[PDB]
RNA sequence: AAGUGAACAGAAUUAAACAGUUACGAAA
């Protein structure tokens, strides 16, 4: 969960990351707004946001080169299909924070 | 003798305002000015401390004859409505607010909204260069109701000044609509509007005379 | 003593402008800087933060005696109108703006319109070569109005120069009509036009002097 | 909705798609301006835009061979008749993003 | 000291040119590049963005001595009129354009016309085969006026090149008349004519200096 | 445990510490809310707060310069891996209190 | 029929971060 996220994210390519934490505030705004809402009501009620959450990881993956190189390595699209329960969705929301905190640990 | 008058109203936000919550205490999204919400659910709630301090501020500048140097010490006609920490005659006030919650969730989900609070992007100019320090804030939705209940009670002895106190509460609520409420309202974010201003009796000991 | 003067006006847009909303935060269409709109409906509303940073900038370059270098520090005749983060005499501002909403929707559909926002094709040429980087923008509608309200109030003591403040607000609003408002209005996008500039008294404590 | 769209859009013919994002800037504007407007007022009031959306998939479909081959495979004209309610129209607007996000995933 | 000089002129189109505006956005058919018109009505309007990149390109060849490649990187006597994205001294521009609307429709429709934009039939020859590619374009009317106003303002402090700025704007508008404006101007379609070039004062702070 | 906290924390660099006790109320809120809750239930049950505690020492380490210079010297990330038992976690909760008492004695 | 990949910087800062009227009341 958090042990394998410190080594896979560091192993990249050329240094000096030109991507900051402000240009990726589109695909990260729905994951933070879903964990706090799924803990109140049930999971079978919110059906319009689950299908729309997967689109953000595909539409934004062909408009920037600093996005496709991170999804294929961290395997984001694979975890979007295994989830199906409300308790399982809570685990994927905590793993997304590892790709943001550890990303600015070596630079910004 | 001793009654419990309740002034039920619906606070309709004609313009999205901002309320500074508990910074550096929430989750990973503690930036972009975190707005205080519900500690259990996600429905944004408005605190009652910002209402008692703002209503008393606008009231202590038109119904007085001396500049207030320190709190809990200004005139006397309005000190018994909110309280007084330096007076020896009266201590407990006669106005009790309530942390109103967003009760507009019965029809807000039917329109299909993204989130309860959005993030607005702003910046500033140093008057010597272009864009500098790209900051960001957080606001709420527009046209949302709130269950606001005013717990009013008399101390039996203060019975000959009932009609005189009604014109003060009505003047304070109407004047509050023409001023920003919360925080960062200088740019035009506050300005509330009390909708459906009515009164009722819960304990049942005083007649019903006022309404609007 | 304490009055609430309201300067009701209609901001008529003689030319469609562009305002950069929350980048990377929209819904179904987030291409070429999505313009900020209403969090409930779809009518694009103009933010009140642009009316405070632009009007103060254009006024602090004609009514001053020293070149300003940082905000909240320019002359003194206009510091009490917007605010001051260094002076301990006054902190709150006497001018309150409001997010003006588009009230022209009651008759806009009768003229036969398509949508509220369109995509304008505008790119650039690198001189040495042909077409390079075919970018685009997103503008709003043309010939639209906005119900803007200016909440003005005095602090009792600020009474011996009420007429001096009226000529400053009137000159600031008229000067804004001959300048672009919003963002990237250098290509002829802004240029507002304040229509029906009148004044009224809501609280009722001061007489009516100005009107046009 | 989003699971069957990743396989049907990929199965085409010859590679190197000539249909870029320039010739699709006409039919993708009315769909984006429909989901955000149908949520405000009622569905029975907007009558000049519902019938006009079907015309774009008929007149503009015969101007290029690279248009009819995509409508018949994605079944766009079939869903235009089943919709009749405001809640049903919101579902068809989310399916349009699958033909744009997944299209640029393999090329552009 | 700080005035708002307005240059009111009438752009007369001697030949129906073509400007590639927001294409693929017409009524019942976007064929032959639909010319951008009014977003509310149907009167064709000219965009003000085309008058900024073409006038600056035709001017950055005579008032300078260094052939530049990227804009906002040339000299200094001409970069202030349009802006500079590198210099720290000045950032904003002093020239404000305006989307001029076709004001000639008040008397042209009385004569009896069909539409404002027609379709011209053309073709091309590859000089190796016969006639092929039956293409076509869309042009406008002939001899039409426009309301183009140039808003100019000084910064009071840097008031020295007053007479120098007059000879640049006058020469820039005269040189544009002898050159095509817009796209596809190689077959003799552009060539505008600024009729009635005058100046006036709207604010009221500096006397009328220039005129012709 | 508490003897080396008076020498390692004092040996720093330039005087006049600009960091007070109000800007560090985010990473110090979960340490006090963990020692008083791990004694009631078992340690194998609380699996969501343990992984989230390490995130606070990573996201807040790349934003302020007054945070990275303290974690590398006090070895905060090193003790997060040795712990694994409920009794061992009780010792780490007491070491954090030593870095705060001696910090306000020399300044604020 | 006709190469179309909005480009490049700052990623929230400088005040103020417990102020006061004050403590076993009447039995063995």
Swiss-Prot record, chains A, D, F:
Keyword S-adenosyl-L-methionine found = no
Q: Which InterPro entries match?
A: CRISPR-assoc_prot_Csm2_III-A
Q: Name one GO molecular function term.
A: RNA binding
**What UniProt keywords apply to this chain's record, in alphabetical order?**
Antiviral defense, RNA-binding
Report the record's Gene Ontology biological process terms. defense response to virus
So which domain of life are we looking at?
A: Bacteria
Assembly and binders: Part of the Csm effector complex that includes at least Cas10(1), Csm2(3), Csm3(5), Csm4(1), Csm5(1) and mature crRNA. The Csm complex is elongated and slightly twisted with a maximal length of 215 Angstroms and a diameter of 75-80 Angstroms. It has been modeled to have a central protein filamant of Csm3 subunits along which the dsRNA helix of paired crRNA and target RNA binds. The filament is capped at one end by Cas10 and Csm4 and at the other end by Csm5; ssDNA is thought to bind to the N-terminal HD domain of Cas10.
Q: Which family does it belong to?
A: Belongs to the CRISPR-associated Csm2 family.
Anything further noted?
Encoded in a type III-A CRISPR locus.
State what this protein does: CRISPR (clustered regularly interspaced short palindromic repeat) is an adaptive immune system that provides protection against mobile genetic elements (viruses, transposable elements and conjugative plasmids). CRISPR clusters contain spacers, sequences complementary to antecedent mobile elements, and target invading nucleic acids. CRISPR clusters are transcribed and processed into CRISPR RNA (crRNA).
Q: What is the name attached to this protein's record? A: CRISPR system Cms protein Csm2
**Species in which this protein is naturally found:** Streptococcus thermophilus
Q: What is the lineage of its organism?
A: Bacteria, Bacillati, Bacillota, Bacilli, Lactobacillales
What's the encoding gene here? Answer: csm2
Swiss-Prot record, chains B, C, E:
Annotated source species:
Streptococcus thermophilus
Q: Which InterPro entries match?
A: CRISPR-assoc_RAMP_Csm3, CRISPR_Csm3_endoribonuclease, RAMP_III_fam
As recorded in UniProt, its EC number(s) are 3.1.-.-
The protein's UniProt keywords, in alphabetical order, are:
Antiviral defense, Endonuclease, Hydrolase, Nuclease, RNA-binding
Keyword RNA-binding in annotation: yes
Subunit composition? Part of the Csm effector complex that includes at least Cas10(1), Csm2(3), Csm3(5), Csm4(1), Csm5(1) and mature crRNA. The Csm complex is elongated and slightly twisted with a maximal length of 215 Angstroms and a diameter of 75-80 Angstroms. It has been modeled to have a central protein filamant of Csm3 subunits along which the dsRNA helix of paired crRNA and target RNA binds. The filament is capped at one end by Cas10 and Csm4 and at the other end by Csm5; ssDNA is thought to bind to the N-terminal HD domain of Cas10.
Highest taxon above the source species = Bacteria
State the needed cofactors, names only.
Answer: a metal cation
Q: What does this protein do?
A: CRISPR (clustered regularly interspaced short palindromic repeat) is an adaptive immune system that provides protection against mobile genetic elements (viruses, transposable elements and conjugative plasmids). CRISPR clusters contain spacers, sequences complementary to antecedent mobile elements, and target invading nucleic acids. CRISPR clusters are transcribed and processed into CRISPR RNA (crRNA). Csm functions as a non-specific ssDNase. Base-pairing between crRNA and target RNA to form a ternary Csm complex activates a ssDNase activity; target RNA cleavage suppresses the ssDNase, a temporal control that prevents uncontrolled DNA degradation. Viral RNA transcripts probably tether the Csm complex to the viral genome, recruiting Cas10 ssDNA activity which is able to degrade DNA in the transcription bubble, spatially controlling the DNase activity.
Q: What is this protein called?
A: CRISPR system Cms endoribonuclease Csm3
Q: Which gene encodes it?
A: csm3
Note accompanying the cofactor annotation: Endonucleolytic cleavage of target ssRNA by the Csm complex requires a divalent metal ion; Mg(2+) has the best activity in vitro, but Mn(2+), Ca(2+), Zn(2+), Ni(2+), and Co(2+) also support cleavage.
Family recorded in the similarity comment? Belongs to the CRISPR-associated Csm3 family.
Keyword Hydrolase listed? The answer is: yes
Print the organism lineage: Bacteria, Bacillati, Bacillota, Bacilli, Lactobacillales
Spell out the activity regulation.
Answer: Target ssRNase is inhibited by EDTA.
Picking any one GO biological process from the record gives: defense response to virus
Q: What else is known?
A: Encoded in a type III-A CRISPR locus.
Q: What is the effect of changing residue 138 to A?
A: Wild-type degradation of target ssRNA by the Csm complex
* NCBIfam families noted in UniProt: cas7_TM1809
Drop me one GO molecular function for this one. endonuclease activity
């Amino acid at each position: 969960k958090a042990e394998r996220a410190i080594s896979l994210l560091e192993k990249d390519n050329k240094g000096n990351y030109l991507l900051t934490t402000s240009q990726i505030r589109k695909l990260l705004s729905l994951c933070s707004s879903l964990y706090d809402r799924s803990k109140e009501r049930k999971f079978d009620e919110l059906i319009n946001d689950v299908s729309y959450l997967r689109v953000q990881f595909v539409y934004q993956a062909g408009r920037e080169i600093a996005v496709k190189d991170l999804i294929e390595k961290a395997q984001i699209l694979e975890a979007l299909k295994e989830i199906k329960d409300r308790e399982t969705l809570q685990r994927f929301c905590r793993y997304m924070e590892a790709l943001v905190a550890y990303f600015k640990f070596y630079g910004g | 003798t001793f009654a419990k008058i309740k002034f039920s109203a619906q606070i309709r936000l004609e313009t999205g305002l901002h309320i500074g919550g508990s910074d550096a205490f929430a989750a990973i999204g503690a930036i972009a000015s975190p707005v205080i919400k519900d500690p259990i659910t996600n429905i944004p709630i408005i605190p009652g401390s910002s209402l008692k301090g703002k209503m008393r501020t606008l009231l202590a500048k038109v119904y007085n004859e001396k500049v207030a140097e320190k709190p809990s010490d200004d005139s006397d006609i309005l000190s018994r409505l909110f309280g007084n920490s330096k007076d020896k005659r009266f201590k407990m006030g006669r106005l009790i607010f309530r942390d109103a919650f967003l009760s507009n969730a019965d029809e807000l989900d039917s329109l299909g909204v993204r989130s309860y609070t959005e993030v607005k992007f702003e910046n500033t100019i140093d008057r010597i260069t272009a864009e500098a320090n790209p900051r960001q804030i957080e606001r709420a939705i527009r046209n949302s109701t709130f269950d606001f209940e005013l717990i009013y009670e008399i101390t039996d002895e203060n019975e000959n000044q009932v009609e005189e106190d009604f014109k003060v509460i009505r003047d304070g609520l109407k004047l509050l609509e023409l001023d920003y409420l919360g925080g960062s309202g200088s740019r035009g974010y506050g300005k509330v509007a009390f909708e459906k201003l009515k009164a009722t009796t819960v304990f049942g000991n005083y007649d019903v005379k006022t309404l609007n």
